[PDB]
Design a protein around this ligand. Structure first.
Ligand SMILES: Cc1cc2nc3c(=O)[nH]c(=O)nc-3n(C[C@H](O)[C@H](O)[C@H](O)COP(=O)(O)OP(=O)(O)OC[C@H]3O[C@@H](n4cnc5c(N)ncnc54)[C@H](O)[C@@H]3O)c2cc1C
Ligand SMILES: Cc1cc2nc3c(=O)[nH]c(=O)nc-3n(C[C@H](O)[C@H](O)[C@H](O)COP(=O)(O)OP(=O)(O)OC[C@H]3O[C@@H](n4cnc5c(N)ncnc54)[C@H](O)[C@@H]3O)c2cc1C
Lengths: 314, 314
């Protein structure tokens, strides 16, 4: 803060944490990871991760991520709990980091790690009921729906997993998806087809969620034949994908700071180098991201290794 | 073996194991990981890994890798304990995998994961004494040098780490490196400068290791001023880097199966796609590899995700 940072890391999920670990273990002394909440990012809202190689114990996202803070902070990494609004490239080659509330930081290098956020499904009442029966986090809100029926929308690994989790809590789940077959791991699909508490509604979509100020009262589902089915349920959870959070790269002339991809990803090469010297990107934000925890970690380590070499070069 | 494989994975280190985990969890049913020894690969010979994010317990390479086999084999991954000699691309788009002893396998897709092997340092007697006092594995051979003096050659994280490990076993270590400063994590360097049992010989190199059929008897070191120092020691361990194992991509006309990099790496894009359809590469073998365990795991998951999409496409 008094002196210019070596690296500013924007986001504290697996990619940020991992970049912070590598940059500081590696020898850089002023490394701040700006994460608006607590670190962990997206996965902390999952009920089950099991595919992170080298971690053989199946557990929830919060338990999975808990040890990371201590580990990734052993060599001096700092966590500032603030939101970042904008990255700028200075005429001199340094970076300016704009923070919420009008504060500013300077940095030789920047690794943008800001992750992704839940896509809109696109149905009537989605926005109007968000936080009053419409949700994108089952671990946060499950408890409110104990011994109650809810809907879950989506057909990927995430939807099914959170449907299994909600099946231990709610009396019943309607799992709704627009295709006849799920795009998801077969062992998860088998557990879902075998769970007496989950009813599949396939080749279907959500027409409307309705209710009033007190909350959601129900969901209208459009079935394969074009008919409507009225689900009398106080909650629906949506898991239809996520968009990249790339707001902070947008300049005041509405252009992006570096080369972007068609779908909003930041363009990078294998070393996570963007088109702008000293700006790196890792995790879901980078080009062609597979959207996995192990991969966001790999990327973060690459970025830090490239941010170190770049710093040694000047 | 009776039917064509979905994926053949060549190598079982972190990258292979991780690719096998992803490909099988993902739904592919015939996936063989060909690993000539036991899985784990290079890191199993390290005395300490601590920087694999999400694993907060510091431990040796064998303990680190032990849980992986069970985890990465939960969805049907097969381990064939055989060496692979050659990859071929069939006129029809399938792959032929040539094994040691004249056996053959077929596969829709191939992920080459074969890792790297210890570079030669380039000194007189290096080859002549290999396995009779010259070594590249301190955990394998340390025990033979209990209460004895040895030399360690190299100046990276690996050399220093194995020098710390050998310092609990041997009476003394001479750490030799060609530069005045080590290219390594500062916390490791500090532990090395603080260890009463390790003597640094900087700006130096090895002129000759000598001895006879009974083994190494000593090392001649060339010092910064051009003079020779005779280290009377029965062992020297070298850690001067590694080369990629890319032998199996070489065809009979001596050309490589796909586009290669100047330093022997296999050219890939972000999705670990090589120039040849259905051939992927991950870990140290791929272009610009950072040479880290977390990264080889990330890559392996990417490759498997790309091998799945490719397979669904045909
Ligand atoms: C429900 C669910 C289940 C999943 N299950 C699995 C699984 O089983 N296996 C698997 O591999 N993957 C799974 N994933 C994917 C995995 O969670 C993501 O790939 C991964 O976390 C992406 O990591 P990241 O570090 O790139 O970004 P993120 O996880 O999003 O980390 C980004 C962090 O940056 C912070 N941030 C963003 N913008 C700013 C800013 N402006 N200022 C300050 N802070 C900011 C955010 O608050 C967030 O905490 C799952 C994802 C979800 C949603
Ligand atoms: C001493 C040492 C210490 C290290 N310490 C760290 C550390 O602290 N942190 C870190 O991140 N990284 C460390 N590394 C680096 C890390 O070990 C490598 O980056 C990583 O293991 C590369 O993984 P890979 O899966 O690409 O290849 P590998 O680890 O080499 O795995 C390849 C496997 O493929 C098998 N194989 C190869 N060719 C064939 C074939 N023809 N047929 C059948 N099988 C074959 C081999 O037997 C080998 O087991 C260290 C490396 C060494 C040598």
């Amino acid at each position: 803060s008094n002196a210019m940072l070596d690296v500013a890391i924007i986001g504290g999920g697996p990619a940020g944490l991992s970049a912070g670990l590598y940059a500081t273990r590696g020898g850089l002394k002023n490394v701040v990871m700006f994460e608006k909440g607590m670190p962990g990012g997206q996965i902390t809202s999952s009920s089950e991760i099991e595919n992170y190689p080298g971690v053989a114990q199946v557990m929830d996202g919060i338990s999975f991520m808990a040890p990371w803070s201590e580990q990734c902070m052993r060599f001096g990494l700092k966590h500032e709990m603030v939101g970042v609004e904008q990255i700028l490239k200075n005429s001199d080659g340094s970076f300016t980091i704009k923070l919420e509330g009008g504060k500013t930081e300077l940095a030789k290098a920047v690794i943008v790690c800001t992750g992704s956020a839940p896509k809109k499904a696109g149905f009537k009442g989605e926005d109007e009921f968000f936080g009053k029966g419409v949700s994108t986090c089952a671990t946060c809100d499950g408890f409110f729906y104990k011994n109650k029926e809810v809907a879950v929308l989506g057909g990927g690994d995430t939807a099914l997993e959170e449907a299994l989790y909600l099946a231990n809590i709610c009396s019943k789940i309607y799992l709704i998806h627009r295709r006849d077959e799920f795009r998801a791991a077969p062992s998860t699909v088998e557990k879902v087809k075998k769970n007496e508490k989950i009813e599949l509604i396939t080749s279907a979509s959500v027409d409307e969620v309705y209710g009033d100020k007190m909350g959601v009262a129900g969901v209208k589902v459009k079935l394969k034949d074009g008919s409507i089915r009225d689900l009398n349920v106080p909650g629906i959870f949506t898991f239809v994908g996520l968009n990249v959070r790339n707001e902070i790269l947008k300049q005041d002339d509405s252009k992006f700071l570096c080369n972007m991809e068609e779908g909003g990803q930041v363009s990078v090469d294998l070393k996570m180098q963007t088109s702008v010297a000293g700006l790196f990107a890792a995790g879901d934000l980078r080009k062609d991201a597979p959207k996995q925890v192990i991969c966001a970690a790999g990327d973060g380590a690459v970025a830090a290794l490239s941010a170190m070499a770049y710093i040694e070069s000047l």
